[PDB]
Structures are given as C-alpha cells and as structure tokens.
Design a protein around this nucleic acid. Structure first.
Length: 54
RNA sequence: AUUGAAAGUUUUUUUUUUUUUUUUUUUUUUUUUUUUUUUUUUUUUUUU
C-alpha cells in the first residue's frame, strides 16, 4: 500500500526452516513517478489478497 | 506363166582416256543468385 516503504519478503536459500535467514525489504531510490495513486488504483481494481511474512 | 530368172547391203570396230566440288569462316557480345527475417519466449540453486 505504501509507496515510500515496502513489507518484508522471503528470499534466499533458507527462508522457511529458519527465522534469521531470508528477510529482505525493498525501497525506491528514485521515486520520480507518481506511485501512491497507482497503488490505490491497483488495489481498488484487483483487490489483491494482502499477506504477511513470518 | 511378165523379155526373166536368183541372189540379206551383209559382214568387222566397246564413245574410250585425262579431272578429289575444292580453299578460306572460333555459335560469341553483354547480365553480381540477391532481397526483406534478433536463435527468441516461459523457469527464484534450491527443503524434513
């Protein structure tokens, strides 16, 4: 939902059989494009199933 | 049936010889097998 900050994502070799391995987050370094309106449109059109990452 | 007649114009002789339809005469002169086409798309080096 937030353009200026992402959630935590599982990625790497071990991300299920471990707690301290496979926790990464994304961020925009050049937010030069309007993004919040785009995210709002996407969630208002498709209504994606929000999920949480252990 | 004569004045009154009975006789092959016949035998014999090669139209033959000499002489290459011959010499010269390149089926060649030219014409680009080119021309448009991305070896491309899909796939988390990974779990009890």
């Amino acid at each position: 939902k937030d353009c200026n900050g992402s959630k935590v994502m599982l990625l790497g070799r071990f991300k299920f059989s471990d707690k301290r391995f496979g926790r990464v987050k994304f961020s925009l370094k050049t937010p030069i494009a309007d993004c919040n309106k785009l995210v709002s449109d996407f969630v208002k059109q498709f209504n994606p199933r929000y999920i949480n990452e252990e």
